[PDB]
């Protein structure tokens with residue numbers, strides 16, 4: 034009664050070896066395990082096969098093998114802050130609480146360029162490396178507005194990296210400006226855009242996208258705007274909204290499109306699964322998937338996305354425990370709101386995040402825009 038304890042005790046390489054020598058493991062799971070040992074790409078039908086057949090333990094062996102081969106114990110997080118230009122939107126995403134169908138313009142606010150600069154200036158004494166800019170799409174927040182803001186932010190703090198806006202936003206403002214995607218992203222980069230976050234991906238396949246995100250930019254337009262960014266030397270992230278009404282093959286379709294794009298242009302850094310949460314949206318009725326399904330999803334993302342450096346977990350949207358366990362199922366990269374401020378006159382701190390990473394035996398690296406170390410907290 035120590036067979037399972039023996040398995041759990043094995044290093045990463047030997048766990049993979051043990052699974053390959055198990056006579057009772059189905060031939061198809063072995064063949065995928067051998068592909069991972071040989072650094073061979075997993076095909077679409079193999080991806081769907083993992084989702085529909087592979088257990089958590091098996092997926093851990095393969096995902097953690099790939100994660101440790103690429104990163105060892107390195108677990109990355111950056112020091113950034115968020116500006117939300119508006120919390121109302123012209124689109125109707127069924128999963129989103131900003132949908133024009135459940136939130137009128139009057140419940141909401143709209144920042145001016147002055148307002149965004151006043152928020153940015155509050156961080157002037159923080160060693161933040163990056164600002165994340167995202168929110169609703171509204172017609173007053175146009176190409177002119179965002180180019181004006183990028184120029185002011187770059188003149189005020191030239192070394193602050195601007196990770197601003199998704200293809201959902203760029204499709205809208207380029208179409209209104211009458212700019213091609215290439216010319217628009219070129220213009221925005223000159224004004225001071227540095228990279229795009231991975232938002233607005235949802236699920237790409239029309240069968241799902243028509244039902245959860247009908248009106249905003251489609252898969253073709255999302256991938257095309259990332260292509261133009263990559264051709265201009267910009268790095269970008271990619272997301273996938275999972276655990277709602279999609280089938281497993283929709284997730285593999287989504288990752289397959291991302292993987293081909295990455296083969297063409299190579300500018301993706303991180304793939305960020307986003308777990309559907311059924312609070313405060315028109316998908317209220319839709320049941321959330323289990324923690325086991327979240328961990329299997331990170332694992333298959335690590336296995337499938339062989340040309341993406343980083344699998345990233347957004348800590349805000351999941352339990353502490355799921356975030357921590359994800360670091361053993363393919364995740365090397367963490368996004369959170371780091372908040373180290375002392376409340377003078379009466380939130381995840383760096384110390385709390387460093388402790389969560391060390392608790393599951395990982396090396397917490399605070400990283401810069403190039404994913405190089407600012408502080409290696411394993412030596413602190």
Ligand SMILES: Nc1ncnc2c1ncn2[C@@H]1O[C@H](CCC(=O)c2cccc(C(=O)O)c2)[C@@H](O)[C@H]1O
Pocket residue numbers: 128129130167229230231232233234235270271272273274305307308309310311312314347350368
């Ligand atoms: N109910 C929901 N349940 C789950 N997800 C929801 C819900 N509502 C909205 N979202 C998601 O938020 C995204 C925008 C945020 C985003 O992509 C992001 C976040 C952190 C880091 C980066 C990065 O690139 O570093 C990008 C939307 O596209 C949507 O898919």
Ligand code: MET
Pocket residue numbers: 167168169170199200201202232233234
């Ligand atoms: C706040 S949602 C993320 C940004 C953009 N509105 C999108 O759907 O892509």
Ligand code: SF4
Pocket residue numbers: 122123124125126129130131132133168169170201249
């Ligand atoms: S576009 Fe982005 S913000 Fe507007 S509704 Fe859809 S998800 Fe929410």
Ligand SMILES: [Cl-]
Pocket residue numbers: 167198199230231232233
């Ligand atoms: Cl985003």
